[PDB]
Ligand binder design. Structure first.
Ligand SMILES: C/C(=C\C(=O)O)c1ccc(Cl)cc1
Ligand SMILES: [Zn+2]
Length: 258
C-alpha cells in the first residue's frame, strides 16, 4: 500500500485499495451545529490521564504518533457516550499548509488549522488489533487547533520534531502529559464513524470537543517542516495530511451541551 495525501495517492484514490472508503459510517464529517441535537442522557465525560506513560514519538510518513504504554489502565477515557473503559494508545495531529485548512472535522464548514486525535481502544476486546474489528472498538477524542497564543503543553512536542524529520524516524518521548493539550471545557459532539486514514475501519465513536485550543504560528510552522519522505529521498513537506469531510448518510451527531 502506497497511500498518502498527494494528487496521485491522496484521499480520492483510497477507495481502490480500501473499498470501505465509500462506506456508511466514514469520517471525518462536517458538524452542522444547527442540526446536532442536545442529548440529555449523555453521561459526563471522564478523561483520566493522571497515570499516563508516554514512550516514543514516531514519524510514520503520514503524521507523527506519540505512543503510550497501554499494557494497563494508565490513561483512560470513559463516560460520555461510551460504555466501559477505553485505553489511550497514541495521539497524533492533522494539519494544513496554511492556517485556514488542516482539520478533518469541520464545524458549519469551518476548517481549523489542525486537529488533534487522541486514540483509545475498548479494553473488553483485549488488544488494539482486535478492537479495530468492532463497531465500538475505538474512541477518538478530537480537538481543534487554531492559531493564536502558544500552547505551553505542546512545546515539548514541537521541540522534538527536529529529531524525527523523516519517515521511519523515532525518538524517546517519556514523561509527556497529555492533559496539557486539553481545552478548559469538555463540551463535545459525538457520532459513530471510522478511522480517517487507511484502513478506514468503521470502529470509532468520535468525541469532538467544541472548544478549540490555541497554538502559536511558530508552533504550527514547525509541524509543517516535517517530511513525508524517508531520509535521503527528495523532500516533500508534511503538510495537508487531512482527509476531507465524508457523507453523513444515516447518522446523527449528538451534543453534550445546550
Ligand atoms: C489509528 C489509525 C488510523 C487513524 O488514525 O485514522 C490506524 C492506522 C493503521 C492501522 Cl493498521 C490501524 C489504525
Ligand atoms: Zn487522526
Amino acid at each position: 500500500h502506497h497511500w498518502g495525501y498527494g494528487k496521485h495517492n491522496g484521499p480520492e484514490h483510497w477507495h481502490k485499495d480500501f473499498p470501505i472508503a465509500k462506506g456508511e459510517r466514514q469520517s471525518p464529517v462536517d458538524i452542522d451545529t444547527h442540526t446536532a441535537k442536545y442529548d440529555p442522557s449523555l453521561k459526563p465525560l471522564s478523561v483520566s490521564y493522571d497515570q499516563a506513560t508516554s514512550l516514543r514519538i514516531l514519524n510514520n510518513g503520514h503524521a507523527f504518533n506519540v505512543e503510550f504504554d497501554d499494557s494497563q489502565d494508565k490513561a483512560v477515557l470513559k463516560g460520555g457516550p461510551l460504555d466501559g473503559t477505553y485505553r489511550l494508545i497514541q495521539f497524533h495531529f492533522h494539519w494544513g499548509s496554511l492556517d485556514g485548512q488542516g482539520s478533518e472535522h469541520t464545524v458549519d464548514k469551518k476548517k481549523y488549522a489542525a486537529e488533534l486525535h487522541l486514540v483509545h481502544w475498548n479494553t473488553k476486546y483485549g488488544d488494539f488489533g482486535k478492537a479495530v474489528q468492532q463497531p465500538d472498538g475505538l474512541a477518538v477524542l478530537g480537538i481543534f487547533l487554531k492559531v493564536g497564543s502558544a500552547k505551553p503543553g505542546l512545546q515539548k512536542v514541537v521541540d522534538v520534531l527536529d529529531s524525527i524529520k523523516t519517515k521511519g524516524k523515532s525518538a524517546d518521548f517519556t514523561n509527556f502529559d497529555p492533559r496539557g493539550l486539553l481545552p478548559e471545557s469538555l463540551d463535545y459532539w459525538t457520532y459513530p464513524g471510522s478511522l480517517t486514514t487507511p484502513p478506514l475501519l468503521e470502529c470509532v465513536t468520535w468525541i469532538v470537543l467544541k472548544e478549540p485550543i490555541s497554538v502559536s504560528s511558530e508552533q504550527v510552522l514547525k509541524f509543517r517542516k516535517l517530511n513525508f519522505n524517508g531520509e535521503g529521498e527528495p523532500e516533500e513537506l508534511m503538510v495537508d495530511n487531512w482527509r476531507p469531510a465524508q457523507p453523513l448518510k444515516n447518522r446523527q451527531i449528538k451534543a453534550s451541551f445546550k
